[PDB]
Design an enzyme around this catalytic site. Structure first.
Site, PDB file in Angstrom:
ATOM      1  CG  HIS D  62      -0.618   4.244  -1.316  1.00 15.95           C
ATOM      2  ND1 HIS D  62      -0.722   2.949  -1.772  1.00 15.95           N
ATOM      3  CD2 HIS D  62      -1.413   4.303  -0.220  1.00 15.95           C
ATOM      4  CE1 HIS D  62      -1.572   2.269  -1.023  1.00 15.95           C
ATOM      5  NE2 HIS D  62      -1.996   3.065  -0.063  1.00 15.95           N
ATOM      6  CG  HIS D  81      -1.437  -0.319  -4.220  1.00 20.29           C
ATOM      7  ND1 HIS D  81      -0.300   0.186  -3.621  1.00 20.29           N
ATOM      8  CD2 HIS D  81      -1.575  -1.588  -3.748  1.00 20.29           C
ATOM      9  CE1 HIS D  81       0.213  -0.727  -2.811  1.00 20.29           C
ATOM     10  NE2 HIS D  81      -0.539  -1.813  -2.872  1.00 20.29           N
TER      11      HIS D  81
HETATM   12  S1  FES Z   1       2.584   2.585  -3.724  1.00 13.06           S
HETATM   13 FE1  FES Z   1       1.904   3.890  -5.363  1.00 13.06          FE
HETATM   14  S2  FES Z   1      -0.310   3.532  -5.517  1.00 13.06           S
HETATM   15 FE2  FES Z   1       0.337   2.421  -3.683  1.00 13.06          FE
END
Ligand code: FES
Ligand code: MGD
Ligand code: F3S
Ligand code: F3S
Ligand code: FES
Ligand code: 4MO
Ligand code: O
Ligand code: O
Lengths: 132, 843, 843, 132
Positions: D62, D81
């Site tokens: 992500h 997140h």
């Molecule tokens: S950086 Fe891993 S859930 Fe957003």
């Protein structure tokens, strides 16, 4: 590098082209025969003021026979196995044995009327990379 | 125009895994190889780093083995891992000598790829109609539902309430394993009478005529096309439809390239460049190509009136017999000498519906068939001079007094043409009379459609004539329909009516299903059976994509096709090859033979649970785990010479395989049969071939003369080179659909002008049988009044305007179709990009 | 697990075309840019050869602007040419601060691409039911047919015979251009009464309660979630459903990150880290994430009994008013001071079905709502101490007696929850009483669904309550149905009955159409009308894919969605952006607003040819050639502050846009409104807010209590993070479908053990409304007796088991649903690869 | 060069790994953090005698936060997140914000116990080419 690096090669000048007579060129190097053709009506991939100058590989994408041009019909024709390609419609194989419509050059006209090729939209017969 | 913008391709590395691959598609059976290697590895341009041992940094010359088009590349699952694949034609295969047609060469691109998003339409999961829509589910669930409905219906109503439609052919969607599994299920375990085949609406042969005469329809070899003095090509468009046979074997004859070999193998007679007679109401790219290679003076295009082949052949037979251009010794030694009696209703009708023609000696056939040149010129519309010329090109002795060698090849122009039985026999008469069977440069053969791969239990219970299945279905009969590998919505005759009724009957079952509870399965089954008793039909589809008929079905079962399984079949020369599996079936899809076996197992279980244990036991003999098990139970135990053939032995023969039947096995080679009938001993009890007393009797099928008289245009129909069949794969292939988003209808330009139509206009074709749509394609070679519409196409189905008319043996007379034409819309914008130029190569 | 095997991506060059892009999807309206550049060119890793000015030869750090996932990359047509495109989240956008959710970050990969074969399911040509199947055709043909049937039915039966289903939302499949276009057709040119909205079966508001009270539902800004002392989160699963609001604004509050910001904007008062109350029967990943970010002492999860929110809010209101924990001057100054007498049927029913709640003063509302902690603990199943604690976190003054600031955020747990009008009102009471509207760190707001993009003519003719469209349809009423950008087959309430009847009624018209001549259009039209007159329905679908309801439709019209067109909408903060076209519509597909216009033009032509010139002329005002023409005729001329907004000015503002309404334009900036109601002047005639006297009256909607008492489980329903809506795009997205091939039904492991189920088992959920399927997912956090099934999913529709029950204003009560569960199949093989592990992050 | 040329890199020996205990590694260079992990059961992409050794990037696809491993659960977990990945199922994102399942290494065990990596099946966070 993720994509092929095409060179921007000068092929000829707009002034060298006579309506409906192909001019033999080569792109993206000397071993990949093609033609520039002024068609006299605005067409797909066509450049120049009338929108009617196109560049194609003239090597049959089926088994590599050199294509002939019928001036009466404005088609490329393969004496190998009877294929027909329409340069007025992006090189569309009107009828034939290739799995590809005719490879067509991405062309640009500079302010002096010089015609450059900066790409090809399909894989040229006989090479596994369009830029060797 | 469609352009892939694929600038370069991964190189096959020196260590790629090599697989023998027969083309999925047409009769010719071109040989290919599939090279796979791991995602994350690749070859390089230096000879030691690629499979070709060539420096790929240099432009390759014409016909290079070290090149492949983008359509021959993909990434596929293989044992659960993503691998690169290249599927490319074999230079060493004597069938194609490196040629890949427009269809074969896109095998890779029409394969399923999660990584490159090709063929995302492929079925992955069983689907059942429940809760208002199709829903995915498990095999055990879906099979249990199919077997309970099927078993309950057959127990209450008999086997005759089970209706079946299946492939009988070879290649992808057929082959020896798949025909056996399905045939064992419906003909061993069961005695299903109400079964039809993928292209015809009863369980018949396409060519009962030639078979009754003792001449199996695939009796020659492909070399024979190279060796003939004359080719007679009847109702074939071989450049488009048997492409690589035409290009790799016919063309060298016509060009004179085969003279060396001719004079080598048959010295002691003169040889010239082959000449070709083409019997076809339409001038095709085939005719054009022949003229361009051999010269127009060596091509005789007999542009007959549609459906008048029989009158031509009977005239040729008469003329040839009268002149004595016949092989007297072959006739005396190898053909029926027995006198016989014409049946009471000759000449209009055979002895019964089972036998539309009368089998006889040479001399009685000549007298029964007798037709003058003038009468045949009247009927066919040909000039007298043309018919006389053809008779000379077929029968005139060569310079030494030597017998003229002639290859007679025919396909769907004849077979779906008028009076199939008599017309087939009348053509065979010519090859019989001229001793052109069993000998080099000869043959009277189907040019074929699909490859061949039939092995099944006896069909004797089916009867002759067999049941007309579409008519049973349209008339409200039958209870359950199993449909395997065919899509009548696109390809049956009288398809508009078929679709109206089929939708209505399946809707009844759907409406009952949606209102009953699925989790109480016995209640579901009862609702289904009640709906069937009211006139409904419960319909199960085995396929690889969502089909058109599939939209009416209640269960869908996902099949795996050639390449995702191992598969055996032969080509139009009887050349049997093994296609070696190179990839995984998409999702939970399974080969047809194993679906049949699991269906058999489920029927055994379900019938056992119902208490019908004796009936249940008939469904044993299906313990198969892999497709080779169906090969061994079927081909190996039942085909002539089967005992000599195994996967391992076939694999070693490569793409050249052997020609059936196998006669033996020596020194690692399955030994085979180059031509049939070389000893003059034919496939009848007495070994003698029969001629056919086969008189002309007009348009034979009911309604055909009336259809023709009361409609303006012939709606000839058939193939296009670029399109494969009903475009099941092609519809998610942009190269194909960008060329023809609608099916074309070829029309003479004056015919267009007089009907106020322009290129690209969307037109309705209509008659007593129904209506359909196509796109007008101006075609200067088309005759005035004669149109040709691409058949089988999802975006405009030609079958809609074919009537229900068959011959006595239930052969569908698709080619004789007449209808009216009117405009639906001005050229739609989605065809503005199309070329409407001539398909004919210009010199 | 699904893995793309894409090892590298083309690099965005420095000269790439930049386009501003709002997320296609949720209410948060995260900002992105699409960068495009010609095929056959690319950037390099050297800083001056890419868009980032960064050396792409080395590993970028966490949160880098100089990276994008493969799902952000594609190739698309742009002005007829293939271009590379990357669609990547904007670091400079204040909404998202460079966050892209699992949905938004796949906009590129869910775009239409021929070259890379993405979303090949997208509609390209108008389709019409003819010749027994759907058939492509021209726009002129298809609109003609639609106009003529529509015109004839409406002339013969009145406009009530025209039924409409349409989006009223923003974003892709919505927006100001598209709501104007459709609105203008049905409400200006016509007076269509029998119209429903994409998510509810009548032409109503979701939140009539808060509007009647004078508080419009999007009254705050997203910064208020950073500034509040307490967030009250009702019926929201915001980490899954309003993802980047949660992450980029709520989390900094809970983590303490916004303390410096709170102190600067609001000195004179104490501030701590944000605390959060979550009112949701289910423990969600939002709850877990709050606990992990703030600590458990700072998170009050009120796991209420399903449908008991009103009891809880009335108790909170009672306790806060009795303590005097209220803003006394806000009440005297800004709320309605003279009470008014209860209507005669109170408390059970309102003055009429139009007014379910009684609007009045603060003190009347307190006495009306009055409920003790002990009664609300009985009803809600909460402990007395939990309710008291939440009243403390909402109302208690902070040190020095300063007002506690509270953001009250609600979504579908409340709106599709019990007694929508009264529950909505009782929550608004809490906010009005505590002065928490129009002030920093305040708000009583929808957290929202889609973006917003509504401008339409008056709907006064529609009525209140409006017609319950699904019930008209189910009951055989109506003749023609236009469906735009919604699929009731997957998402309406009572969906199983809806599907049975919709199929049957559309089948009548299908059967008539198949039997009638198409080329004779008058005869086809008459045959449709005869079928409609017998109870059939003629149905037209405007969409971007083949929909489930589309399988029942007679005409399908291909639409162009956001990015293929220009589009305007606002997010849950009123932040209006322009999404700038970056690609071409696939094939001949067309923006919805232009579809409506072409339809209006066709209605005019047709009605004129029928001689109804007066009716024809009502369809003028649709000469639009591009979507901006719709923006200007609609938004520019009708929105408050519309004069100040144009595409040019909006584009100049970028992804940060401005907050509606526009108050002016100076210095190339549109000036907007940060919060609403800052002057305490509410949306009523007298400018005062009303409180609502809204006593608890049990489960309000018909049949709900009987459904609860007579079934075993709660079938809670709603969103999954990974899935967008009805999976219209996602069904051709392997990343999503490899994760959930079936919809999940979350079940407590013990409940599963009791019912004889194992993870992955396919189960039937059934009750009095219908039946459907789902895959059992063991969910240790689930309470015994309570399940949660993914809504809207093609492979298992939850709506099938929702009853027809609505509140008085025809609001669908989807969340209060109960059902039985029983096994269909052991875990299918197509589910063996899945993780069934907990969705909760572990520390 | 049509595809990425991945180096075949030694990462560790079968003997260095303890059941259910990740070991820090990097592949295809020092800047791309990952682990090997021996899981105790036959799994997707798993190598060794028990088919249970897998390798994964540990940088969230992500937004790049390093992933922690929970041993009791056998999951990777993101503090950014709240994403969760299951290395027992090819790294499938159980719940999360990435559009990718966890990049996994194509591993081979040599006859001498050595563990090579010669591939990765997804795009590693922070690079537009897995080999830089
Ligand atoms: S950086 Fe891993 S859930 Fe957003
Ligand atoms: N490209 C391609 N090739 C294929 C197929 C495909 O789908 N695409 N399918 C395969 C299959 S299954 C089959 S069965 C074969 C079919 O192979 P063919 O039979 O060669 O192909 P068709 O186009 O069906 O018909 C051939 C010719 O018969 C002519 N014809 C029509 N009516 C008459 C008549 O009354 N008399 C005579 N003498 N000729 C007539 C037509 O004008 C046409 O040119 O092709 C196979 N090969
Ligand atoms: S390549 Fe395939 S389609 Fe026929 S001509 Fe050869 S078998
Ligand atoms: S990325 Fe798109 S889906 Fe919602 S959270 Fe942001 S708007
Ligand atoms: S080489 Fe051109 S048609 Fe075969
Ligand atoms: Mo919503
Ligand atoms: O066929
Ligand atoms: O929504």
């Amino acid at each position: 590098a993720a994509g092929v690096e095409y060179p921007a090669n000068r092929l000829a000048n707009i002034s060298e082209l006579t309506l409906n007579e192909p001019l033999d060129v080569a792109y993206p190097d000397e071993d990949a025969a093609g033609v520039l053709l002024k068609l006299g009506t605005r067409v797909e991939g066509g450049v120049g003021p009338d929108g009617d100058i196109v560049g194609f590989s003239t090597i049959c994408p089926h088994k590599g026979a050199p294509l002939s041009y019928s001036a009466d019909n404005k088609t490329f024709n393969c004496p190998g196995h009877f294929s027909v390609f329409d340069p007025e419609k992006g090189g569309q194989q009107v009828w034939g044995q290739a799995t590809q419509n005719l490879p067509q050059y991405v062309l640009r006209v500079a302010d002096n009327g010089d015609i450059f090729a900066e790409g090809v939209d399909e894989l040229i017969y006989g090479r596994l990379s369009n830029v060797l | 125009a469609f352009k892939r913008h694929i600038d370069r391709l991964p190189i096959i590395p020196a260590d790629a895994k090599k697989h023998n691959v027969t083309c999925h598609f047409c009769i010719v059976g071109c040989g290919y190889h599939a090279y796979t290697w791991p995602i994350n590895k690749q070859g390089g341009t230096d000879p030691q780093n690629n499979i070709f041992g060539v420096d790929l940094s240099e432009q390759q010359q014409a016909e290079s083995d070290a090149w492949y088009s983008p359509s021959m590349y993909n990434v596929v699952k293989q044992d659960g891992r993503d691998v690169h694949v290249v599927i490319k034609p074999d230079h060493e295969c004597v069938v194609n000598s490196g040629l890949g047609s427009v269809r074969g060469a896109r095998m890779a691109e029409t394969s399923f790829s999660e990584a490159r998003n090709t063929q995302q339409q492929r079925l992955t999961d069983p689907l059942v109609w429940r809760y208002g829509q199709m829903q995915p589910t498990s095999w055990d669930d879906a099979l249990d539902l199919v077997a309970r409905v099927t078993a309950k219906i057959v127990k209450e109503k008999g086997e005759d309430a089970l209706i079946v439609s299946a492939f009988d052919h070879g290649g992808a969607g057929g082959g020896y394993e798949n025909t056996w599994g399905t045939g064992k299920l419906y003909f061993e375990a069961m005695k299903v009478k109400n079964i039809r085949i993928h292209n015809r609406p009863a369980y018949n042969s396409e060519v009962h005529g030639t078979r009754d005469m003792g001449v199996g329809e695939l009796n020659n070899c492909y070399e024979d096309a190279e060796l003939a003095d004359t080719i007679v090509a009847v109702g074939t468009n071989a450049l488009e439809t048997q492409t690589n046979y035409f290009l790799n074997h016919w063309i060298p004859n016509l060009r004179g390239e085969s003279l060396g070999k001719k004079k080598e193998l048959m010295p002691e007679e003169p040889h010239e460049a082959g000449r070709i007679i083409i019997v076809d109401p339409r001038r095709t790219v085939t005719v054009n190509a022949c003229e361009q290679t051999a010269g127009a003076d060596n091509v005789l295009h007999l542009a007959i009136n549609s459906g008048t082949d029989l009158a031509l052949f009977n005239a040729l037979f008469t003329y040839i017999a009268d002149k004595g251009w016949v092989d007297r010794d072959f006739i005396d030694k190898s053909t029926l000498r027995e006198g016989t009696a014409r049946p009471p209703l000759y000449p209009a009708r055979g002895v019964s519906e089972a036998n539309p023609g009368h089998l006889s000696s040479f001399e009685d056939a000549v007298e029964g068939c007798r037709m003058s040149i003038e009468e045949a010129a009247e009927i066919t519309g040909l000039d007298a001079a043309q018919i006389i010329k053809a008779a000379e090109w077929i029968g005139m002795p060569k310079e030494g007094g030597k017998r003229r060698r002639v290859m007679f090849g025919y396909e769907k122009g004849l077979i779906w043409g008028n009076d199939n039985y008599r017309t087939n026999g009348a053509l065979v008469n010519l090859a019989l009379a001229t001793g052109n069977i069993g000998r080099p440069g000869g043959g009277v053969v189907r040019l074929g459609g699909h490859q061949e791969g039939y092995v099944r239990p006896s069909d004797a219970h089916v009867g002759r004539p067999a049941a007309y299945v579409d008519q049973l279905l349209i008339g409200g009969q039958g209870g359950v329909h199993h449909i395997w590998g065919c899509d009548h919505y696109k390809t049956t005759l009288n398809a508009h009516e078929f679709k109206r009724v089929y939708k209505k009957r399946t809707d009844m079952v759907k409406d009952a299903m949606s209102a009953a509870p699925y989790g109480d399965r016995e209640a579901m089954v009862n609702a289904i059976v009640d709906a069937i008793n009211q006139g409904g039909l419960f319909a199960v589809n085995v396929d690889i994509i969502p089909t058109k008929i599939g939209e009416a079905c209640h269960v869908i079962l996902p099949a795996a096709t050639s390449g995702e399984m191992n598969l055996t079949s032969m080509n139009g020369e009887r050349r049997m090859r093994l296609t070696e599996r190179y990839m995984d079936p998409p999702g939970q899809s399974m080969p047809d033979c194993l679906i049949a076996a699991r269906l058999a197992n489920t029927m055994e279980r379900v019938l056992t649970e119902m208490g019908d244990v004796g009936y249940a036991a008939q469904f044993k003999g299906f313990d198969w785990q892999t497709e080779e098990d169906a090969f061994m139970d079927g081909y190996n135990k039942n085909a002539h010479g089967g005992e000599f053939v195994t996967y391992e032995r076939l694999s070693a023969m490569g793409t050249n395989g052997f020609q059936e039947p196998a006669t033996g096995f020596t020194d690692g080679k399955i030994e085979g049969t180059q031509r049939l009938y070389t000893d003059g001993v034919f496939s009848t009890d007495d070994g003698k071939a029969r001629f056919m007393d086969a008189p002309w009797r007009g348009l034979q099928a009911p309604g055909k003369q009336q259809q023709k008289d009361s409609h303006k245009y012939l709606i000839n129909n058939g193939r296009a080179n670029v399109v494969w069949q009903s475009a099941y794969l092609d519809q998610e292939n942009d190269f194909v659909m960008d060329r023809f988003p609608y099916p074309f209808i070829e029309m003479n330009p004056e015919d267009m002008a007089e009907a106020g139509l322009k290129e690209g206009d969307l037109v309705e074709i209509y008659n007593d049988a129904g209506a359909t749509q196509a796109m007008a394609y101006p075609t200067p070679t088309a005759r005035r009044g004669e149109t040709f519409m691409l058949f089988g196409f999802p975006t405009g189905v030609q079958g809609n305007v074919t009537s229900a008319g068959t011959n006595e043996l239930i052969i569908p007379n698709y080619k004789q179709t007449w209808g009216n034409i009117r405009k639906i819309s001005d050229a739609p914008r989605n065809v503005a990009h199309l070329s409407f130029k001539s398909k004919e190569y210009q010199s």
